[PDB]
Design a protein around this ligand. Sequence first.
Ligand code: CA
Ligand code: CA
Ligand code: CA
Ligand code: CA
Ligand code: CA
Lengths: 86, 87
Amino acid sequence: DVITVYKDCNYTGFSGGLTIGDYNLARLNSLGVLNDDISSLRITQGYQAILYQDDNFGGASTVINSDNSCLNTTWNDKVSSIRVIA
Amino acid sequence: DVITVYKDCNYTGFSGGLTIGDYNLARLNSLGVLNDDISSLRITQGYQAILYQDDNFGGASTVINSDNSCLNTTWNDKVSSIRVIAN
Ligand SMILES: [Ca+2]
Ligand SMILES: [Ca+2]
Ligand SMILES: [Ca+2]
Ligand SMILES: [Ca+2]
Ligand SMILES: [Ca+2]
């Protein structure tokens, strides 16, 4: 995996590993990752995660290109879909 | 390279790529990385960097197990040797 999303801040709690591709809520759930639940994530250099407020890559978005130990109030427990790219 | 050390904060400036192993100042210099100069580091999941205040792994140490965009006052521009190990 090149991206790992964690339930709690500081890279702890249930985690899901992601590789290049698109992850709507259903796909995140298949990994055990819940909606409006991610709080931190690791980004392997050379990759990035585009976070989306709504499912199916809709709503406001933000790009994470380095490990984030605790998402801010706008993004913490708000992610519903993610796109991972090189 | 599972670990990249940068000259400046926010992963910018001259960078050196490190893999599993031990890096005294001599080895860091062979990569162009200077003494008391590192300010940020990217660390690939599954690996970690043990920083040392002095050369040859001497003095105080600290572990960087996730990207650090700007070392604190105690470690910024103070690293003299590093060891990369599995995490
Ligand atoms: Ca959470
Ligand atoms: Ca990383
Ligand atoms: Ca949401
Ligand atoms: Ca510096
Ligand atoms: Ca030093």
